[PDB]
Amino acid sequence: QISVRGLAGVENVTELKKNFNRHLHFTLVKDRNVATPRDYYFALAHTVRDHLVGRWIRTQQHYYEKDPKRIYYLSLEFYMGRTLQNTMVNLALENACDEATYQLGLDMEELEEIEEDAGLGNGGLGRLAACFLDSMATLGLAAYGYGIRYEFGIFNQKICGGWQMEEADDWLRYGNPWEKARPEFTLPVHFYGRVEHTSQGAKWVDTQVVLAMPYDTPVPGYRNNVVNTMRLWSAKAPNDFNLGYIQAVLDRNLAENISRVLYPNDNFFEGKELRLKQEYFVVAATLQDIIRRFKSSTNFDAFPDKVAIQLNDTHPSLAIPELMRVLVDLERLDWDKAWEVTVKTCAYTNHTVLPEALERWPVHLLETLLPRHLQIIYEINQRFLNRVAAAFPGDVDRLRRMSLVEEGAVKRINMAHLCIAGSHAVNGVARIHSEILKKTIFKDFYELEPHKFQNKTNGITPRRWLVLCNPGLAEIIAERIGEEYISDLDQLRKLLSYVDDEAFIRDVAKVKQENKLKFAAYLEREYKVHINPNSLFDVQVKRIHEYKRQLLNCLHVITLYNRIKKEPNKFVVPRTVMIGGKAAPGYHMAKMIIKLITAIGDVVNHDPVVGDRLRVIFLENYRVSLAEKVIPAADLSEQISTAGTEASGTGNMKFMLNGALTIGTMDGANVEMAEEAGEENFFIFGMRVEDVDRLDQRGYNAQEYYDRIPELRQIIEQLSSGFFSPKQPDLFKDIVNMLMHHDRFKVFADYEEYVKCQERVSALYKNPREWTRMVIRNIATSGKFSSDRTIAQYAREIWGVEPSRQRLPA
Amino acid sequence: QISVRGLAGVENVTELKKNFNRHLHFTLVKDRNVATPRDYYFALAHTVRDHLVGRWIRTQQHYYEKDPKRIYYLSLEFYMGRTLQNTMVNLALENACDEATYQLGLDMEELEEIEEDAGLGNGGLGRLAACFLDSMATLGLAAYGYGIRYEFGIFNQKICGGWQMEEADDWLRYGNPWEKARPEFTLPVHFYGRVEHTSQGAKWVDTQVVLAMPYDTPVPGYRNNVVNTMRLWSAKAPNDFNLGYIQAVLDRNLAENISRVLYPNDNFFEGKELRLKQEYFVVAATLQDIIRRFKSSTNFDAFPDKVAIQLNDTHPSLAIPELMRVLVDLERLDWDKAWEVTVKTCAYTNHTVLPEALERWPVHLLETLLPRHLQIIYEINQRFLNRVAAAFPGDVDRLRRMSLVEEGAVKRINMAHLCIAGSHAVNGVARIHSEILKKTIFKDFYELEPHKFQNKTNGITPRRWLVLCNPGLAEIIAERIGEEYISDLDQLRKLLSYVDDEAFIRDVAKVKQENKLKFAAYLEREYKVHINPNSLFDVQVKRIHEYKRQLLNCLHVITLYNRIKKEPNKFVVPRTVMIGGKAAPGYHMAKMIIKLITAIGDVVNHDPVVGDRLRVIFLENYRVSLAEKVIPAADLSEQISTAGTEASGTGNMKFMLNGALTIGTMDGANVEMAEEAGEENFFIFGMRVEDVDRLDQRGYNAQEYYDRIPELRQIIEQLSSGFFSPKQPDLFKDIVNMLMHHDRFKVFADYEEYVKCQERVSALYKNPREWTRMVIRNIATSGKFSSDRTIAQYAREIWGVEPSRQRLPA
Ligand SMILES: O=C(O)c1ccc2cc(-c3n[nH]c([C@@H]4O[C@H](CO)[C@@H](O)[C@H](O)[C@H]4O)n3)ccc2c1
Ligand SMILES: O=C(O)c1ccc2cc(-c3n[nH]c([C@@H]4O[C@H](CO)[C@@H](O)[C@H](O)[C@H]4O)n3)ccc2c1
Ligand SMILES: *Cc1c(COP(=O)(O)O)cnc(C)c1O
Ligand SMILES: *Cc1c(COP(=O)(O)O)cnc(C)c1O
């Protein structure tokens, strides 16, 4: 049908049909009389999987023969979403599979909707890992993602009476056709025990053993026949575990709970023992696998020439002392040599500066669970502080600030300090964030070792986030500038030559309108809600957190409602305001924010005077597959975190690539997006980082804003008095009290500029031609935000390897 | 190579090779450079599985179209063993697969040894269910086996310092290629709650729900292209289960524990709540599936014309009140009509008379777990006793003896009484056992309803238990009388015409000698033990239980040792005495018996005066795959239970078919085996049932035997004084005390006759020609003990269906 989806040749279509029928019969054990739609989905998935396996085997053989430096990306989260369509895109099979299934009397889009998201992450951090795997394969790097195969991923969100309810995400219930269990590479992981000191050195003895069983998932690159591996570990009890008899077998569940469930926190450190076990489990299994692969080509001097380990925040920070443990205790390297190898092998990426997100583990927990690792950490600390003291003699407060060990009621280990000490490179994830690291939280470390500190601005894969989710846009671009941009996104700059082309302007606007109609129809069918598709689609989708300021958006929505009620017969640009995202189950204020959004919706959506001029919709169960539907349909992207809090953001980039304009603060990657597009093509408002600092020095007093802004005062009175909760008048008192007295994120301070800026958005939307010209200027300058650019920078500047766009043979 | 293994045609061999390579590449994702032997096993299993699926689909379609009466065999145990070789035998693929694998450079026998036993039973009861499934498919019955998919089957037995240690049987660790998950037929099962009485009738409300997910395994018939289904249920928590958040997800394990592990008891009722949950789980899921299939062809009058439910002991006895519950509470049938349907649908097979094996559930457990079922049981009881009182007016003691409710400190439900009341047929499993049922434990029931009571003597499948495990014997038989006997075992009678044929005598003896050499070599390789293969192989393999009298065998072994020590330079027929079997983990005396056997071995096997004249070997981890190796190698089969205790036995039959002579009591099916072969061709000894009864009336006094038999007294003194446990002199005091004062199974009473009978065995073994002639007379008359004969009798006399040997089209 459309060119970017590839060729549907007669021989390919015939072969796919015959393999589809083969899998239906032999793999699924069904015929066409009893087959369900889910059976047809599986028959297609197995058919497509067959095209991966030859390439997967050949890729891994190629790495064995050439022995390149291997890159190991360690993460507690990989937010993969669905695999079927992405695999077809990367193998150039989409049109052929569409035709094959069409000839069999089936609709491939319907079959795609049956697949479960692999929801093994919380949001941006986990999704970044997934984009990165795609880019590493597309750039021909010998890369492996290592994580945990959680039985239950991020919870499914239901809304009941306007409140979030959680249910378990039993994503493996029907099977996962993409993974391959590799029980033969099962490895032991040790916990508890104690340390014995012999004449041979230290020995970690009397431990409890849990087995780590790997499951491998293929990661195809874009049309280059490279298929890399994501290896995820699952916890298994040994067969003699606890071995009355029946209880001993039932108690195997205690060991196997390590891989049972993803902790559903975003930017919040809980400090639970089970989480620490997960972190060690992934590190310990991964490092043994790394060392095994290294030996199967004594001389650990070459280890950093053959191995790079990238730590995705501090969650796998135990890799540093575990590598030391293996090299010193088991391989018998001297301490100094082991440390040289460790530092040259490891690099650390920081993804947040929020104090509540930083991992600080109590010493008593580490002492019980990982006694040898605690000894190694103390020795690392003593040697590190010896260097600090030599560089800054007499600066005793610096020694306490830089220590890996924090004093207090409970002593804790600061895992970020450990990562900096044991890594040859430390990076932030957007220019402003990397600068904040050097100026504030890691200032002392930057002064000791300035050469370590780098920036690597985040990116997104244009395969999933343009070609897959928005084929109509991909196609109209390809008609003008060809297909090369899909693996070289900088080529989108060529679209600046079409900003005054009437045909291109029309086509850009038509694709958006089609995506809006398709999304409006999705909302009616799956959720029985009716929206005006000629309205401006104003979208804020991301996890619910005070720093992301969904509350500021709520204040604007109420403002627009109150303005309509005051002058009902005045024209206003119609909007559909859509907010979605999950709250962590223990985060009370986040749950109250969800309830506020649905309560505003209950009033606004049923007021006959408003009509279809304003609708407020809470999008339930926001996840990767829903992002693929709503992002292409958006007109306005809300990126409104308090300056200095969103380390980068990546949703911002997805919206830019898909033809939405951005309203946002000068935070994270928003700064660089505005720089690339031109500030005149971005709706920038609010305090800069420097203005937030100036308010903090004087002291933030929310009452001042309340006193001076009548429109704001009206909203707070409506919230307090029960206007949005008539049956429960005090329902929102916690929200009002927080805004008025304890607001760390200064919602009222940006209210006036935000509302004024929103008025400018409305003004531009009334001139469709000029709106669309501005959109073109955004799409055309989005090239920098390809994760292919990001990964090429990590490769050259951190890992010491050269990317390649060359194809392996088919 | 050998004819009974089928044809190896060039086209078949070529096709198997190409599919093997296809599965290695696409299914397993390996090439020949990295493939392990386990990978080759899986590639072969998938290749053979492909030949089943066309037949499986066609068989189930055929039943849908013809709508025959369906037979549902309900069991808590299916002791299947390995599937690969059995599948090849039943599809006539064995020689073709041997050739195909040979051409690929692989040894198929080595690959067969990689497969795990499906150990989902304890012993005879579970294995009988497996033989029965094979016979039902071979006889073309529309039959389904329904059970539980235990995650952990019967434990793996290790012997450490002569003691049994248990380890978990993690049989699913590498995957099971034979099963197919059917998550689409998942059904809810209810527990706890309470009963509400409305004007519409009773309602069971406020229940906890567990989901039952079915896994289907194909059951191929012998060369008839019929493939039936074994459906096993696995427990799953619903997604809203317990829905802080993390603990709620972890606590899903409480529901899922229902299918976690097989209770490892043989003939011993423990009475644990988890076991009751297992029993209801299997019944409730199965009955819904049955009713669904019945409706998918209001009128339950035809239900018993389309459905038969066979209850394998009382373990699924809750099927009776569950069927009543569904018909009365949900379908709104009147009680009397529902009862008529239930009785005509259900039939009960009893497999034991031991008092400690009979299920008697406390009322307080049923009241909490299954409150509606308890109400229905009480109503069944009241109506049943009303009939008893009308038939035997004034007989108040009969009313108390026959009640389903037993009075006492704790009130209990007698599940056997429930099964008799609610079934149209009740059978025992050997003639003597069925007679015991009518004369003793069910005498009252027999007097009320004599027409209900039947016999169905047990059998074994000649596919697994001759063709598969002893191809050399199958072949030499086929050379004389053709292949038809494999599905018509009565044809073995034709071998009586060869009892004086010198060539046949030679061949029978040669096959035994080959099997003995092969087994002697297996023992050296896997267990580092050396045996004389010219010795008489004296074998007792079965679960360890006081009633089976492994202790009587021990007394004979010590007797032979003491006789050698007394006259070292006298000739004695050399023996290798092999004893194997598992003890239930909580059964202390059974564990002590294992320790005694290994302790006797420690003395006997290292005495230089004995030499290779006597060896005592404990065969570790006895299970179906070990039975297939040792049974063909045996000369003497030990079947020495106290008369009246072994309901049938089936190991006895396996040994008879494979060319061993039997030493045994007139117990269970031993009576019928002796009748078929002629008493002159059997080594019968000991008390008959009537003699045991006479001793019980006078009172058993073990001291009398001790006082009168010097050889017995010497053994007891050796045990007591520490001769077999020099480091721990009192180790065996519990055994001595039991034998002398509390022996329910009268070991000393059969000692003299047993030893004398063993002397006659030795005498015959010295004349190989006459030994072999007697063997031929046993093999030739073993036809009655085919499970095909057993199943044909159930079909005609209980289920009301006609067996068929006709082939479905290929
Ligand atoms: O469960 C926990 O203990 C825990 C603790 C901290 C956590 C921090 C994060 C986390 N830190 N930074 C992040 C996000 O990472 C993205 C990719 O670079 C950034 O675009 C985004 O601005 C940032 O908020 N997520 C996620 C889960 C966590 C879970
Ligand atoms: O775990 C329990 O509660 C429990 C209770 C009773 C049990 C009884 C048996 C059981 N009863 N009879 C049997 C065996 O069934 C075979 C097939 O008909 C007979 O050949 C054999 O003589 C008999 O002992 N096993 C098995 C497991 C049990 C488990
Ligand atoms: C991209 C993405 C995120 C991150 O969005 P931000 O606006 O950068 O927080 C979160 N969740 C999902 C499902 C995503 O696809
Ligand atoms: C046949 C068999 C049994 C039953 O043997 P009996 O001697 O009848 O108790 C027990 N276990 C296994 C593994 C079997 O094959």
Swiss-Prot record, chains A, B:
What is catalyzed by this enzyme?
[(1->4)-alpha-D-glucosyl](n) + phosphate = [(1->4)-alpha-D-glucosyl](n-1) + alpha-D-glucose 1-phosphate
Q: Is the keyword Nucleotidyltransferase in the record?
A: no
Query: Which keywords annotate this record?
Result: Acetylation, Allosteric enzyme, Carbohydrate metabolism, Glycogen metabolism, Glycosyltransferase, Nucleotide-binding, Phosphoprotein, Pyridoxal phosphate, Transferase
Q: Which Pfam families match?
A: Phosphorylase (PF00343)
Q: What is its EC number?
A: 2.4.1.1
Q: Which InterPro entries match?
A: Glycg_phsphrylas, Glyco_trans_35, Pyridoxal_P_attach_site
Q: How is its activity regulated?
A: Allosterically regulated through the non-covalent binding of metabolites, being activated by AMP and inhibited by ATP, ADP, and glucose-6-phosphate. The activity is also controlled by post-translational modifications including phosphorylation.
Q: Which residues carry this modification: Phosphoserine?
A: S3, S403, S487, S720, S721
Modified positions (Phosphotyrosine) in chain numbering: Y192, Y215, Y446
Site description Can be labeled by an AMP analog, residues in chain: Y144
Q: Where is this site: Involved in the association of subunits?
A: C97, C131
Q: How is it modified after translation?
A: Phosphorylation of Ser-3 converts phosphorylase B (unphosphorylated) to phosphorylase A.
Q: Where does AMP bind?
A: D31, Y64, R292, R293, F294, K295, S296, S297
Example GO CC term: the record gives: skeletal muscle myofibril
Instruction: Indicate the enzyme's highest-level EC class.
Output: transferase
Q: How does it assemble?
A: Homodimer. Homotetramer; to form the enzymatically active phosphorylase A.
Q: What NCBIfam families does the annotation carry?
A: P_ylase (TIGR02093)
> What is this protein's function?
Allosteric enzyme that catalyzes the rate-limiting step in glycogen catabolism, the phosphorolytic cleavage of glycogen to produce glucose-1-phosphate, and plays a central role in maintaining cellular and organismal glucose homeostasis.
Annotated family: Belongs to the glycogen phosphorylase family.
Output this protein's name.
Glycogen phosphorylase, muscle form
Which organism does this sequence originate in?
Oryctolagus cuniculus
